[PDB]
UniProtKB/Swiss-Prot annotation, chain A:
Involved in transcriptional activation. Component of the SWI/SNF complex, an ATP-dependent chromatin-remodeling complex, which is required for the positive and negative regulation of gene expression of a large number of genes. It changes chromatin structure by altering DNA-histone contacts within a nucleosome, leading eventually to a change in nucleosome position, thus facilitating or repressing binding of gene-specific transcription factors. Interacts with RTT102, SWP82 and the N-terminus of SNF2. Component of the SWI/SNF global transcription activator complex. The 1.14 MDa SWI/SNF complex is composed of 11 different subunits: one copy each of SWI1, SNF2/SWI2, SNF5, SNF12/SWP73, ARP7/SWP61, ARP9/SWP59; two copies each of SWI3, SNF6, SNF11, SWP82; and three copies of TAF14/SWP29. Residues 6-97 form the SWIRM domain. This is SWI/SNF complex subunit SWI3. It comes from Saccharomyces cerevisiae (strain ATCC 204508 / S288c). Present with 3150 molecules/cell in log phase SD medium. The gene is SWI3.
Curated annotation (Swiss-Prot), chain B:
Involved in transcriptional activation. Component of the SWI/SNF complex, an ATP-dependent chromatin-remodeling complex, which is required for the positive and negative regulation of gene expression of a large number of genes. It changes chromatin structure by altering DNA-histone contacts within a nucleosome, leading eventually to a change in nucleosome position, thus facilitating or repressing binding of gene-specific transcription factors. Belongs to the SNF5 family. Present with 217 molecules/cell in log phase SD medium. Coiled coil: none annotated. This is SWI/SNF chromatin-remodeling complex subunit SNF5. It is found in: Nucleus. Component of the SWI/SNF global transcription activator complex. The 1.14 MDa SWI/SNF complex is composed of 11 different subunits: one copy each of SWI1, SNF2/SWI2, SNF5, SNF12/SWP73, ARP7/SWP61, ARP9/SWP59; two copies each of SWI3, SNF6, SNF11, SWP82; and three copies of TAF14/SWP29.
Length: 97, 209, 94
């Protein structure tokens, strides 16, 4: 499948799929306590890369919370918040037109 | 001090001298609107006075037993909750539209906002506006159920393992990293379906009480 | 489409603004002591009743229609309904 132009806003060139930045541990502090076994960094990266790698397969099309809580197990509210973080930073849904 | 009581009013024509199906959110801290004045405005359809009395006594009964969010009650304030996820089942009919759905919801994280979720649901599925209140009532009504069972079991809402073997068994299992991706068997039921439906199918459903 | 008719003592009302009469009569949205009750919420609840009723001047608009469509608790939509009724902004030409 021919890949199209990855396009995020410049204040987010810091995002890297294979690591967790500082801004993410401050914005989404529920996966970074060490007290909830179901919410760690390893699962954070899954939830987060699936949403991001999904939206990039076709960036002209809104990726949604429903298609994320269908595919991945975890608190839907936690996934609502992850979805909105990534929307703020334009890492999700930046081009939906 | 949020205490929206999820009210469910249901009275049949057989054992109740009248029929009525309704749901609402009653804010228990607002003591200044009379229940009786609200019910008499609800049912502009008519022994009227004695039927208002039995409805109010139902609303009152539910306000007087409502178990407000125990976390915002017995101080904890643990960010991100103790991972007590519930299964929130939806089966909502609004006119001809019926929504079936299932999603996990954490009952021990007081920053989960049902109205914020219900309102993006109705944006993404583009549901008719009426679904927003109904999805929110159903989140709050199913969450309360578990908040009121744990209560009558003396659970301390602090984070310990759930004693009761049943209540513990309805609680979703812990999410290791091999569990993040849903099996095909679960992603079937954990997703929304919006059917159109007729008066005739509606009859089949209601006749399933 | 419909030409809306309100009483002469309610020309202060503006869908895009809030007036002190409104702050006076429904203080529960402006005390900032509850997060789900804010001026933005007040305008959403309030305009949904005034604009919904203005599509059908001749039909009564009800508290039940209002709480089915808007996320507010029942008591506050009743009180909001009561007030818009008092000033002739819903249900004035039913």
């Amino acid at each position: 499948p021919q890949a199209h132009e990855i396009v995020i806003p410049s204040y987010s060139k810091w995002f890297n799929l294979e690591k967790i930045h500082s801004i993410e541990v401050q914005s989404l502090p529920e996966f970074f306590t060490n007290r909830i076994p179901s919410k760690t960094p390893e699962v954070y990266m899954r939830y987060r890369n699936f949403m991001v790698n999904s939206y990039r397969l076709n960036p002209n099309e809104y990726f949604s919370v429903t298609t994320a809580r269908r595919n991945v197990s975890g608190d839907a509210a936690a996934l609502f918040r992850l979805h909105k973080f990534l929307t703020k930073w334009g890492l999700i849904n930046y081009q939906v037109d | 001090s949020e205490q929206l009581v999820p009210i469910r009013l249901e009275f049949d024509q057989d054992r109740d001298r009248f029929f009525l199906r309704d749901t609402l959110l009653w804010n228990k801290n607002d003591k200044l609107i009379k229940i009786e004045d609200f019910v008499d405005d609800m049912l502009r359809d008519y022994t009227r006075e004695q039927h208002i009395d039995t409805i109010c006594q139902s609303i009152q009964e539910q306000i007087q037993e409502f178990q407000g969010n125990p976390y915002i009650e017995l101080n904890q304030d643990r960010l991100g909750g103790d991972d007590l996820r519930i299964r929130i089942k939806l089966d909502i009919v609004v006119g001809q539209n019926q929504l079936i759905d299932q999603f996990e919801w954490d009952i021990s994280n007081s920053d989960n906002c049902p109205e914020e979720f219900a309102e993006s649901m109705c944006q993404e599925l583009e549901l008719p506006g009426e679904f927003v209140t109904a999805i929110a009532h159903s989140i709050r009504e199913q969450v309360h159920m578990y908040h009121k069972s744990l209560a009558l079991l003396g659970y301390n809402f602090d984070g310990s393992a759930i004693e009761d073997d049943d209540i513990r068994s309805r609680m979703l299992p812990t999410i290791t990293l091999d569990d993040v991706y849903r099996p095909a068997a679960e992603s079937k039921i954990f997703t929304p379906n919006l059917l159109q439906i007729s008066a005739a199918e509606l009859e089949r459903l209601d006749k399933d009480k």
